[PDB]
């Protein structure tokens, strides 16, 4: 009651987000599988008893930390759920460890600040308290559904995977409502433990909503019209810039080339070069210090660390002194509440480094047995490592960031790719791991007219399900560089 009170105080201000989040949130496309958010935990025209789980799925950097943390600062102000819900209860998942064994009640009392909460009277109405489960695929080492016994106490302290997936299956707390967020590779594990559940996908933002991050971004009507020009006369950057973490890329991008006397131009076309056309104008250190870099999001993702500590990154190089050159520059951000821990801008950024690990000029760096990985849960899914890998290789493409790579292991690697393809096609009895349309993401990325005629010869036909723009464009581009013995 009076509690609540002290609990939306806190929730007002600690989902700022000043890293105002209001002065910069566009609002993103939902679409139920045009949703009214109020609406969300109400029931269909069928369905008399309301929706207890909703599932939001979405693409990595489309916002679904965003968007939880704006329905917490909605609801803490009176916008949103204000007679639906008492509490609301953000899980930042990547901070969940899944052998920690703790309690449901534990869990509340980390979103509380104070250090004796009220859980008795906080767990007094299940029905009313929503947990907000951000970033399921963010859940660091495996999350199995066999995992087992269930519990049915929020008292009682379990593992931390027997904790989510009980809370998940609604086995502890079963009238308390659920939003989790999820990129859709992790939707397979998911699927698994939702009881009814409501799913929901960020399609980020419409063709009008680009234009109006370009213009929430740029202070200058003169720039920001200029800017948005740039991705209004390049095909790619506009089909990618839906994507709110590519917006806040290409902007930033842009912004470090305004600074100079330099015409705007961004001749990007695949999602490698936009990162490293992005990593290029932060490039002033980020060239001496590019080893320990690669090393610490290589070693973080073999071993599924998200949140690195001071003790992590100072064994790979970067000291005090280095971590604020990474900082300042918005590479290497403090989260985990007011603790020195210290985690990349985005996991795309982290996907990125550990690709370029393994083509650095000097863990292991056996592309082999990184691929072998790939589709795994407990690894990050690699979605990202390969599709970087794919890109960087690109013999014929160099920049900066490209010139600090070695020529003679991104050509075995680039062999080892190929081989990896034919695997793939031929073999395709498998319960998914690299789509035939994943594949398609990974021959746009390497671009090179060589390899990708070769690598399409493998598949035996064309069986994809076209959902983006996006879909029709990286796998319309593959679809032109594949021909046949003798066609024509
Ligand atoms: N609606 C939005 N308005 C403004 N920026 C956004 C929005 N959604 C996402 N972003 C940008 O994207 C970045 C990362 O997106 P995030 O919400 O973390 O997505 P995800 O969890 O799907 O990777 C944010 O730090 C911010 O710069
Ligand atoms: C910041 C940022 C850049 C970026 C570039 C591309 C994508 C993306 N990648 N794959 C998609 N769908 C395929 C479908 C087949 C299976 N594979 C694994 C997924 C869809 C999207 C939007 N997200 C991105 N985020």
Not at 24 to 41: G, H, S
Not at 170 to 187: C, D, G, N, Q, Y
Not at 271 to 296: E, N, R
Not at 420 to 436: F, M, T
């Amino acid at each position: 009651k009076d509690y609540r009170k002290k609990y939306r105080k806190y929730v007002r201000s600690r989902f700022q987000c000043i890293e105002s989040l209001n002065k910069r949130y566009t609002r993103l496309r939902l679409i139920k599988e045009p949703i009214k958010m109020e609406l969300l935990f109400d029931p269909d025209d069928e369905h008399s008893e309301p929706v207890h789980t909703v599932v939001f799925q979405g693409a990595a950097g489309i916002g679904k930390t965003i968007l939880a943390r704006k329905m917490m600062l909605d609801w803490a102000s009176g916008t949103l759920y204000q007679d639906r819900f008492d509490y609301l209860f953000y899980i930042h998942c990547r901070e969940v460890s899944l052998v920690t064994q703790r309690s449901l009640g534990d869990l509340i009392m980390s979103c509380c600040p104070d250090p004796n909460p009220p859980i008795h009277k906080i767990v007094r109405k299940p029905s009313r308290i929503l947990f907000l489960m951000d970033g399921f695929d963010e859940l660091q080492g495996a999350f199995d559904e066999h995992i087992g016994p269930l519990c049915t106490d929020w008292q009682k302290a379990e593992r931390g995977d027997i904790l989510l997936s009980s809370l998940i299956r609604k086995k502890l707390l079963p009238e308390a409502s659920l939003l989790i967020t999820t990129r859709p590779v992790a939707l397979e594990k998911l699927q698994h433990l939702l009881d009814h559940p409501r799913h929901v996908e960020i399609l980020g933002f419409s063709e009008a909503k680009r234009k109006e991050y370009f213009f929430k971004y740029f202070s200058d009507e003169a720039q920001a019209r200029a800017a948005f020009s740039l991705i209004q006369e390049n095909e790619v950057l506009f089909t990618m810039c839906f994507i709110p973490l590519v917006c806040w890329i290409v902007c930033t991008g842009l912004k470090q080339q305004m600074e100079s006397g330099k015409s705007l131009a961004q001749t990007s076309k695949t999602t490698t070069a936009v990162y490293v056309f992005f990593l290029s104008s932060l490039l002033q250190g980020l060239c001496a210090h590019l080893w320990g870099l690669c090393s610490l999001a290589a070693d973080g993702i073999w071993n599924q660390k998200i949140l690195f500590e001071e003790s992590d990154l100072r064994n790979h190089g970067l000291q005090k002194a280095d971590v604020s050159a990474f900082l300042r520059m918005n590479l290497f951000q403090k989260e985990v509440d007011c603790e020195k821990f210290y985690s990349f801008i985005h996991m795309t950024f982290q996907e990125f480094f550990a690709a370029m690990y393994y083509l650095l000029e000097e863990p292991s760096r056996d592309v082999t047995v990184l691929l072998e990985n790939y589709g795994k849960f407990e690894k990050g899914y690699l979605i990202f490592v390969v599709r970087f890998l794919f890109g960087l290789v690109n013999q014929e493409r160099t920049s900066y960031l490209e010139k600090k790579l070695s020529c003679k292991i991104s050509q075995q690697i680039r062999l080892e790719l190929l081989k990896w393809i034919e695997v793939k096609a031929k073999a395709k009895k498998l319960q998914i791991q690299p789509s035939q349309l994943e594949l398609f993401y990974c021959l746009y990325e390497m671009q090179e007219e060589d390899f990708v005629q070769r690598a399409m010869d493998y598949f035996p036909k064309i069986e994809i399900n076209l959902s983006t723009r996006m879909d029709h464009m990286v796998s319309s581009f593959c679809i032109e560089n594949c021909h046949r013995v003798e066609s024509l």
